[PDB]
């Protein structure tokens, strides 16, 4: 029912905030999973009291208060990037440019656009970070895939240009004029509160540049690590830093072993929800590839099925479950962790659990026929 689900997700004393849920994507439908147990500016969600799919063990999920407020950049730097001429010309190795794809992401309404992601994986951050974040969103959707263009193709020379323009390194087209405003708004934030803003573009240009590995893999952790660069894991950890101010240092190694169950489990996670639209996209000759943990475990113990597959690949999102929270526990009792140190956890945390709410509640992966009334 469209009903029941959104009148007992969250406090009706937050409805007016509240994102409407319109989907319910099972991606273990078909799976045997008959032994596998599942067990401010910011609300509550509780997906567990609801009928919705919840295929994980997590229980803490936020959604953003001030998301409405956050649309308007990311409207306006897809409509700047399609009505651009030289990004009509920016094309990748298939020929589309990037004028295109953001008129592509203009056809999806603004209710499940990509953007809607930052709503739930990056709650904490106020009505103005946001806003910046979301903005960032967009120059992943567009910029993705762009390292593999030489740098003497238009695509490469405007992506060298955005490179240029997020260093801050002569008439400037809207867009540019744009792309400036939100290099100049991450400085700001940074004078008020935290030094994750620098970091985030300096992420976002790590992005552009590394290439990833080749596409093949002996091992699991092979995929993942490759994974961890595809997902921008580390702009990832950057936007939730700067999601709350914060200014811990992410690459400390005491965090080290839980961040990287997180970038597993959000790796996991996203492959379990997006394999039945990756799987189209090599039958029907849409994508020359098909990368995606399901089927590298479905190669690497010899299932029958991809829906067999799928149950393994839960059953080691559910095995990861249980490390983060044997590692965020012995980290507590240890005393080793400040509360700055502790509230980034929990925001990581936050991005495990909100990337499962999303990838149920979206149109991105279970397509219309997963519909609510
Ligand atoms: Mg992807
Ligand atoms: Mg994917
Ligand atoms: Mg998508």
């Given at each position: 029912?469209?009903?029941?689900?959104?009148?007992?997700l969250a406090?009706?004393?937050n409805?007016?905030?509240?994102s409407p849920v319109?989907?319910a994507?099972?991606?273990?439908e078909?799976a045997?999973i008959?032994h596998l147990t599942a067990?401010?500016?910011?609300?509550s969600?509780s997906?567990?009291?609801t009928?919705?799919p919840?295929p994980t063990?997590?229980?803490?999920?936020?959604?953003?208060?001030?998301?409405?407020?956050?649309?308007?950049?990311?409207?306006?730097l897809?409509?700047?990037?399609?009505?651009?001429?030289?990004?009509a010309?920016?094309?990748?190795?298939?020929?589309?440019?990037l004028?295109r794809?953001?008129?592509h992401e203009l056809q999806?309404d603004?209710?499940?656009?990509?953007?809607?992601?930052?709503?739930?994986?990056f709650?904490?951050?106020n009505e103005?970070?946001?806003?910046?974040?979301a903005?960032?969103?967009?120059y992943?959707?567009?910029?993705?895939?762009?390292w593999?263009m030489?740098?003497e193709?238009?695509?490469?020379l405007?992506?060298?240009?955005?490179?240029?323009?997020?260093?801050?390194?002569?008439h400037?087209?809207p867009?540019?004029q744009?792309?400036?405003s939100?290099?100049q708004?991450?400085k700001d934030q940074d004078?008020?509160?935290?030094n994750?803003?620098?970091?985030?573009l300096?992420?976002?240009?790590?992005?552009?540049?590394?290439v990833?590995?080749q596409?093949?893999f002996?091992?699991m952790?092979?995929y993942?690590?490759?994974?961890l660069?595809?997902?921008?894991?580390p702009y990832?950890?950057?936007c939730?830093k700067?999601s709350?101010g914060?200014?811990v240092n992410?690459e400390?190694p005491?965090?080290?072993?839980?961040?990287r169950?997180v970038?597993?489990?959000?790796?996991?996670?996203?492959?379990?929800?997006?394999y039945?639209?990756?799987?189209?996209?090599?039958?029907n000759?849409?994508?020359?590839?098909?990368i995606?943990?399901?089927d590298?475990?479905?190669?690497?113990?010899?299932?029958?099925?991809?829906?067999?597959?799928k149950?393994?690949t839960?059953?080691?999102?559910?095995?990861?479950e249980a490390?983060?929270?044997?590692?965020?526990?012995?980290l507590?009792?240890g005393?080793?962790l400040s509360?700055?140190?502790?509230?980034f956890?929990?925001?990581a945390?936050?991005?495990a659990s909100?990337?499962?709410?999303?990838?149920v509640?979206?149109?991105?992966?279970?397509?219309k026929?997963?519909?609510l009334?």
């Open positions: 029912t469209y009903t029941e689900v959104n009148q007992n406090a009706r004393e409805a007016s905030w509240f319109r989907f994507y099972d991606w273990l078909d045997p008959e067990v401010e500016n910011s609300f969600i997906p567990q009291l009928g919705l919840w063990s997590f229980t803490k999920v936020r959604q953003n208060r001030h998301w409405r407020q956050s649309l308007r950049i990311s409207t306006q897809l409509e700047l990037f399609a009505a651009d001429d030289t990004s010309q920016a094309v990748r190795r298939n020929g589309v440019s004028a794809i953001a008129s999806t603004e209710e499940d656009r990509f953007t809607k992601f930052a709503t739930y994986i709650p904490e951050a103005e970070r946001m806003k910046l974040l903005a960032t969103i967009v992943i959707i567009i910029f993705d895939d762009s593999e030489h740098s193709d238009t695509l490469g405007v992506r060298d240009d955005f490179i240029r323009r997020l260093r801050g390194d002569e400037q087209t867009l540019q744009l792309i400036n939100t290099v708004g991450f004078k008020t509160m935290g994750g803003g620098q970091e985030v300096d992420r976002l240009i790590d992005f552009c540049e590394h990833p590995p596409t093949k002996a091992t952790g092979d993942l690590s490759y994974r660069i595809d997902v921008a894991f990832l950890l950057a939730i700067f709350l914060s200014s992410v400390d005491k965090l080290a072993p839980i961040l169950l970038s597993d489990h959000v790796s996991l996670v996203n492959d379990l929800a997006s039945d639209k990756e799987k189209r996209a090599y039958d000759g849409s994508a020359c590839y098909l995606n943990a399901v590298v475990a479905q190669r690497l113990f010899s299932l029958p099925s991809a829906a067999e597959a149950a393994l839960y059953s080691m999102q559910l095995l990861v490390q983060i929270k044997t590692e965020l526990d012995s507590v009792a005393g080793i509360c700055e140190e502790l509230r956890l929990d925001a945390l936050l991005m909100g990337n499962v709410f999303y990838s509640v979206s149109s991105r992966y279970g397509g026929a997963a519909k009334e």
